[PDB]
């Protein structure tokens, strides 16, 4: 009926069924009380779990007057080529470290999240495409070619500036007995996807990694070709554990990176009480811009590290929540048909 009457459906007349929520007072109060209680409990759990973790640091930088490694504080010429001034430092443990132990190194004032620095890498070549190896991208601009004009194998400033220190740990069994070295499981120290999907060294021509890197000069600051980073075929090249760990950039200018973990056969527990020594190999220069270098022994829990921030934040939020709950209850009660 009618040549121009509209269709009269539900949508076209603004009549779609719809639930209309009014913010009542029987929903606000239970929310601000239950949520507050849950936040209090959860934050208390986090706070106590973040405090049962023991850490130990040294700051083996040689900058000040005091310190074993300060004897080999360098100057502005470049003295890595002479002896690496291998220093050492001693400590004692009166108790155990029940649980597997992790060893990190920490740098400060190191801006690994600078925009120009962070994008100076060639992800395509680093993936392992057999064609992209010879031609890097223009982004690794001051680390793209060489003095002889040859292409570089990594093509980046992140790969050029790689941490080149080393550490070893020794323990004494009997009083006066000589120190002995304990193992460091230096394997599986990265994400499983990083050294199985991200990074793959190119296929073997004539069956050798070395024979597939011709022309590719090493980065200017290194001292070894990329295919020589370790005498182990399963850990060499773009999938070297140290190299892949270093390339996962950090978020803040004070970061740490995983170096090793102590869980091997001789004692699959914490470090027994006694006397320990660590040999270092001072090779990375950081004093030029005012950096720092630290070693860190630690353990873990379900949450992770030893940050007390988030638990305290939860406690504060829960306290504020319950206080606002009482304030709202009082305001509601005093106001009824007024």
């Amino acid at each position: 009926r009618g040549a121009h009457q509209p269709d009269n459906t539900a949508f076209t007349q603004q009549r779609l069924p719809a639930w209309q929520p009014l913010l009542s007072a029987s929903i606000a109060l239970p929310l601000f009380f239950c949520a507050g209680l849950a936040f209090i409990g959860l934050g208390l759990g986090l706070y106590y779990s973040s405090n049962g973790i023991k850490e130990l640091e040294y700051d083996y930088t040689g900058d000040p007057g005091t310190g074993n490694c300060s004897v080999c504080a360098a100057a502005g010429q470049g003295r890595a080529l002479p002896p690496p001034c291998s220093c050492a430092w001693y400590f004692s443990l009166p108790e155990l470290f029940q649980g597997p132990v992790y060893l990190y190194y920490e740098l400060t004032n190191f801006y690994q999240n600078n925009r120009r620095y962070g994008v100076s890498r060639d992800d395509a070549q680093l993936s392992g495409l057999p064609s992209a190896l010879r031609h890097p991208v223009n982004e690794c601009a001051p680390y793209q070619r060489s003095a002889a004009g040859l292409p570089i194998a990594p093509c980046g400033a992140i790969a050029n500036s790689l941490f080149n220190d080393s550490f070893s740990l020794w323990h004494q069994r009997q009083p006066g007995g000589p120190y002995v070295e304990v193992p460091l499981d230096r394997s599986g120290i990265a994400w499983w996807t990083d050294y199985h999907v991200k990074f793959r060294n190119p296929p073997l021509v004539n069956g050798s990694l070395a024979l597939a890197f011709q022309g590719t000069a090493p980065p200017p600051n290194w001292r070894r070709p990329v295919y020589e980073l370790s005498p182990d075929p399963n850990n060499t090249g773009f999938i070297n554990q140290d190299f892949v760990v270093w390339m996962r950039t950090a978020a803040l200018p004070t970061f740490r990176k995983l170096y090793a973990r102590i869980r091997q056969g001789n004692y699959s527990a914490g470090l027994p009480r006694g006397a320990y020594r660590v040999n270092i190999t001072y090779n990375y220069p950081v004093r030029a811009f005012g950096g720092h270098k630290l070693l860190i022994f630690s353990s873990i829990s379900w949450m992770g590290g030893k940050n007390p921030f988030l638990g305290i934040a939860y406690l504060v939020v829960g306290s504020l929540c319950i206080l606002t709950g009482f304030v709202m209850l009082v305001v509601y009660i005093r106001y009824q048909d007024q």
């Binding site: 009457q5 209309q20 996807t193 999907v197 950039t249 803040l252 200018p253 811009f289 940050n307």
Partner: protein
């Protein structure tokens, strides 16, 4: 001392024999080169315009320039264009090839398509008026032709009830002496018929087709002038050319009536007609929210510039303190630190530019298009009888509907439906026809009594007094058989019986009703030849003879006749206004107080009354006055005044008969609509071109002005305004030394003071009259005006004398309950609208039909046209067009306020989702050396405001509603919160921005605190950029979508589906980009590989997102709850108490049977008729 006439409609004093030369035949004569003008190129058109009509704006090939010029009136487009130019400079590009141009083109083309669809719609609406098939003389006979091909100089022929296509000169018709009857209800709002007399010479010559196919006459009329009533000119037909005047002219919007056909010469056409000169200056309309968005964009631009400058300074300082000392941030460049800061300035501009993103005018357009299409799908705005669906025509002025301050409305055709319908009468004391008013059938039903005893009843009147007809049948009283006979003798109606059944050709609406009532109460009216009129009194025919017809006049206000019966006896019958009769009645009438006290009841109802009397002239005294006005009839310069003197000589001893009543028929729903709109704090002014008396019964009928309301005509207003202005400035007799104009001492605070103003007094008050030529000296030159800085003619300063009367009058009309302007030129209506919108800055709506409201409809903020009738001149220039006045209830109290609310919600949420997103890089800048590093993934910044958060806001801006419309018309007061800009003004925008900055702060600084130290579980990738970016991004797409759930108050299914679809889309596309699947065959495109499925697998990261969400979302709930039980808003109160409330059904009449302070003494007299219909006394224009 010529005072205002208040009867004239001063078409003069509005502007700012001269060779027009039509010579109507041989078209090629007007194609001569000298007549037609010249333009820059070969494109020179003519002087005589074509008869086509154009309303559309975009022609074939100016749609590109003209649309893009109005497109950049928005500041955001200049913003985007500046960014486009910036991002193309090679020294700072930070991007790939030009993929930042295409989105701008898509955004800029969507609006072009949307603004082209409307143009197409009106371009096809414009087609109807151009295909109406008049008849023209092509070479031989008459042939059917379109309107658009009528050119100036064409002989045309028109039939009855057909519109007049162009300004024509009438030259012949099919009536005696070749005259025509026209009506002009679309030109000046009148409702009675006018008569145009053709020239005498052409009457006796053409008369026929073959002679009409021969013509040589010239016309020397003036140029198009917009006067509508003068038309000087001559006609060189042949052999001593004949002059012309306005009595021989038909205009465009007029329609022929009661003449079979007529012929004419076309004189004007198209945009040269006298009705196309009154509609002028169509403009580009922008709503009130656009002027707010422009300021938003400017302040955001300033903020962006300042922030980028600050960060650039910070980077410059950082670079040569720690940057140029690090061997790992080495570059082959040698840029000095200042140049580094200068380059980081542009990098931060580009990074932080995503405030005001490109999807701002793509969502506004969608929202407004959706609401516009909601308007014309409304089944409750559809008129069943005339079948019109109430469409919307602009789709861009849509949130303006909820901010209206004033309404201006025409009277004829907008508030009334042009029906007269005689209601009741008062014969000798008691009134007749309440509903039963009898003893027989007084306790029966209230059905209509039949008239099945005449051959003339024809069933067209509804009467209910069984007593009146019962007595009439009984013949028990001869005091009524005389009264109802007067109605059938005192008029100028002409009868043209087609075939047996007789129909009445009445020139005035107010006379047809009386003759119809007389005919269907018996007492029919048969032939009226020239001197004798025949009356069928109760089936018995009689023939009297008319001696004189003392005609109607405007300042006389009465009409009478003198007849003689076959029984040799003369009588005089008169009818007219009470206030002029009561100085004429014989001083013996017993029933004067009875009828007078019954004349109030009628006037207490909203209806118009007349008074009737007769006089016994005997058969002797007559002769003296008969030859007296024989001597005074045929004269030279006193036919209209000496005859008036001899008229006022037998208006003594005029014993009464009783009074009548007639009732206008406004429409179904006007007074309820007016009451509803008055509750919502809107003011209604009625601007009409109709008579002053007629626009008072409408004022009382629609209850704009009622009892206990002073009227205060303009006579009083001029005196009051003069007294307040001339005195008490620094003068007024005794000086005051203060003379404070601050107190509104115009009227004491008593309210209910109406204001009825005529056009002439409107001119007088506003200090605007034309000056005659004998008042100024000469032109501008150093002879009349000397060297002393042009002291006389260049020193006008009439704006000092003006600009005070205007402001004073506008402030006077601010405190009146209702203002009615009558007899106004089409230009003066727009003048009043512009005055009200210049001072006391307000949003105005103008509604009305017909061609005399086009100017006012164009000039107001919103123009609504009434459609469904035949003439559609006010519908093609409007913005919205329904078919009844009452639908104004839903266009404002339902659609308008919902649209305003939804747009304000959208604008409040949009500028919150955008700072929470962009303002994180700013806080991050303090921790990475001010290096313009971003805190999100690369693929998240180009998909955030496209996929993740774009649909929920559209669904909320379309489907949301505060309260249902079933009770949004019950509470019109809810309109007020939109009328005063209380939902989104400038002060609220800076609160939405504060919410945004706090959200960004709490979204960045919690994850940073959690990420300060290690976060690894068993793979131990300690705090790293990838996981940090994923954590920050995934905790924003949740809070920004839970917030939109705290805004929607109408949760349809699609709303919840949209919200959770947004969240799930983000998560499920992130787990696809960060995957081993597409790392192959796309190596260097997706930076974050394998991090999503490796960071989101540990509890510590999830305990960080939950806390951020709970902190940046929970105090909002607290604030809402704490601001709702202390200051519950009006809609909150309505929604809270909706469970139990009573129904409502009201508006009976506001009955006021009598007052204890009787003071009115104001008569409801009104008669719509003209002067000069005494042609019968000259000759019988019957057959």
């Amino acid at each position: 001392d010529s005072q205002p006439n208040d009867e004239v409609v001063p078409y003069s004093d509005d502007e700012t024999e001269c060779t027009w030369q039509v010579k109507a035949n041989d078209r090629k004569y007007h194609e001569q080169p000298h007549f037609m003008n010249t333009k820059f190129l070969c494109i020179k058109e003519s002087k005589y315009a074509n008869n086509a009509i154009k309303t559309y704006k975009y022609n074939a090939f100016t749609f590109i320039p003209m649309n893009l010029f109005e497109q950049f009136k928005r500041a955001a487009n200049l913003y985007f264009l500046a960014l486009l130019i910036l991002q193309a400079v090679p020294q700072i590009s930070t991007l790939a090839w030009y993929t930042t141009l295409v989105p701008l083109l898509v955004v800029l083309g969507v609006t072009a398509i949307k603004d082209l669809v409307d143009d197409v719609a009106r371009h096809k609406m414009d087609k109807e008026i151009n295909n109406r098939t008049c008849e023209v003389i092509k070479d031989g006979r008459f042939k059917v032709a379109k309107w658009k091909e009528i050119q100036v100089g064409d002989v045309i022929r028109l039939k009855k009830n057909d519109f007049v296509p162009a300004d024509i000169l009438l030259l012949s018709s099919s009536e005696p002496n070749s005259l025509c009857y026209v009506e002009t209800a679309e030109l000046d709002g009148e409702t009675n018929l006018k008569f145009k007399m053709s020239l005498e010479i052409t009457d006796q010559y053409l008369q026929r087709e073959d002679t009409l196919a021969t013509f040589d006459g010239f016309i020397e009329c003036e140029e198009p002038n917009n006067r509508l009533d003068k038309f000087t000119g001559t006609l060189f037909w042949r052999n001593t050319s004949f002059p012309l005047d306005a009595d021989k002219i038909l205009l465009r919007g007029c329609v022929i009536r009661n003449t079979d056909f007529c012929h004419g010469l076309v004189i004007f056409a198209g945009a040269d007609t006298k009705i196309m000169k009154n509609s002028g200056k169509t403009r580009f309309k922008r709503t009130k929210i656009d002027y707010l968005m422009n300021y938003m964009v400017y302040t955001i631009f300033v903020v962006l510039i300042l922030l980028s400058a600050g960060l650039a300074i910070g980077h410059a300082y950082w670079e040569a303190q720690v940057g140029n000392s690090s061997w790992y941030l080495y570059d082959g460049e040698d840029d000095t630190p200042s140049y580094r800061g200068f380059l980081i300035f542009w990098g931060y501009i580009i990074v932080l530019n995503t405030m005001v993103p490109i999807s701002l005018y793509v969502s506004v357009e969608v929202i407004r298009l959706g609401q516009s299409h909601f308007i014309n799908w409304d089944l409750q705005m559809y008129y069943a009888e005339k079948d019109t669906p109430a469409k919307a025509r602009t789709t861009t002025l849509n949130e303006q509907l909820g901010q209206i301050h004033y309404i201006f409305s025409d009277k004829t055709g907008t508030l009334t439906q042009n029906i007269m319908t005689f209601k009741k009468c008062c014969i000798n004391g008691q009134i007749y026809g309440d509903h039963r008013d009898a003893s027989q059938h007084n306790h029966n039903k209230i059905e209509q009594v039949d008239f099945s005893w005449n051959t003339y009843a024809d069933g067209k009147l509804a009467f209910y007094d069984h007593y009146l007809i019962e007595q009439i049948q009984s013949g028990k009283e001869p005091e009524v058989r005389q009264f109802f006979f007067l109605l059938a003798v005192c008029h100028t109606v002409m009868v043209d019986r087609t075939d047996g059944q007789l129909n009445y050709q009445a020139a005035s609406p107010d006379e047809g009703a009386l003759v119809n009532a007389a005919r269907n109460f018996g007492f029919a009216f048969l032939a009226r030849t020239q001197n004798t009129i025949t009356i069928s009194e109760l089936g018995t025919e009689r023939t009297y003879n008319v001696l004189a017809i003392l005609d109607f006049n405007s300042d006389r206000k009465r009409m009478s006749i003198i007849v003689r019966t076959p029984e040799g006896n003369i009588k005089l019958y008169c009818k007219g206004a009470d206030t002029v009769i009561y100085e004429r009645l014989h001083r013996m009438n017993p029933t004067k107080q009875e009828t007078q006290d019954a004349l109030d009841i009628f006037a207490n109802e909203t209806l118009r009354t007349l008074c009737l009397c007769y006089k016994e002239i005997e058969e002797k005294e007559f002769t003296e006055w008969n030859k007296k006005f024989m001597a005074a009839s045929v004269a030279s310069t006193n036919r209209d005044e000496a005859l008036d003197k001899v008229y006022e000589e037998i208006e003594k001893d005029l014993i009464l008969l009783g009074a009548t009543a007639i009732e206008d028929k406004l429409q179904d729903g006007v007074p309820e609509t007016i009451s509803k709109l008055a509750k919502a704090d809107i003011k209604i002014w009625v601007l009409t071109g109709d008579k002053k008396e007629t626009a008072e019964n409408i004022g009382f009928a629609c209850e704009l002005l009622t009892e206990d309301t002073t009227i205060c005509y303009g006579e009083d207003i001029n005196s009051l305004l003069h007294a307040r202005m001339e005195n008490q400035r620094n003068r007024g007799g005794v000086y005051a030394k203060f003379a404070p104009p601050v107190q509104e001492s115009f009227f004491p605070p008593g309210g209910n003071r109406a204001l009825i103003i005529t056009g002439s007094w409107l001119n007088e008050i506003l200090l605007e009259k034309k000056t005659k030529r004998n008042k100024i000296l000469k032109l501008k030159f150093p002879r009349t005006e000397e060297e002393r800085r042009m002291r006389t003619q260049s020193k006008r300063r009439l704006e000092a004398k003006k600009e005070q009367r205007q402001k004073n009058f506008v402030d006077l009309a601010c405190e009146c309950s209702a203002v009615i302007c009558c007899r106004v030129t089409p230009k003066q209506k727009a003048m009043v609208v512009d005055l009200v919108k210049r001072y006391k800055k307000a949003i105005t709506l103008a509604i009305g039909d017909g061609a005399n409201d086009v100017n006012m409809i164009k000039t107001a903020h919103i123009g609504v046209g009434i459609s469904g009738q035949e003439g559609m001149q006010a519908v093609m220039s409007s913005d919205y067009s329904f078919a009844q006045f009452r639908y104004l209830q839903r266009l404002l109290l339902v659609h308008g306020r919902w649209s305003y609310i939804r747009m304000c919600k959208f604008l409040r949420y949009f500028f919150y989702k955008n700072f929470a997103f962009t303002l994180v890089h700013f806080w991050y800048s303090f921790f990475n050396g001010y290096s313009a590093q971003t805190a999100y993934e690369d693929w998240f910044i180009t998909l955030y405001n496209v996929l993740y958060t774009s649909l929920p806001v559209l669904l909320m801006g379309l489907l949301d509603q505060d309260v249902s419309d079933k009770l949004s018309l019950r509470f019109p007061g809810l309109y007020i919160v939109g009328q005063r800009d209380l939902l989104f003004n400038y002060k609220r925008f800076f609160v939405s921005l504060l919410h945004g900055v706090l959200t960004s702060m709490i979204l960045f600084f919690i994850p940073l605190g959690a990420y300060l130290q290690t976060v690894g579980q068993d793979g131990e990738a300690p705090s790293d950029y990838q996981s940090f970016a994923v954590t920050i991004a995934s905790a924003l797409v949740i809070t920004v979508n839970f917030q939109i759930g705290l805004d929607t108050s109408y949760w349809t299914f699609v709303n919840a589906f949209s919200i959770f679809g947004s969240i799930a889309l983000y998560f499920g596309i992130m787990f696809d980009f960060h995957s081993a699947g597409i790392h192959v065959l796309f190596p260097s495109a997706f930076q974050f590989t394998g991090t999503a499925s490796n960071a989101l697998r540990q509890p510590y990261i999830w305990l960080t997102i939950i806390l951020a969400v709970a902190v940046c979302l929970l105090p909002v709930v607290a604030i809402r709850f704490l601001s709702m039980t202390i200051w519950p808003s009006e809609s909150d109160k309505i929604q809270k108490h909706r469970k139990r409330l009573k129904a409502e059904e009201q508006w009976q009449r506001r009955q006021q049977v009598f007052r204890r302070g009787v003071s009115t003494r104001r008569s409801a007299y009104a008669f719509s008729h003209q002067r000069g219909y005494a042609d019968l006394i000259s000759s019988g224009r019957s057959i």
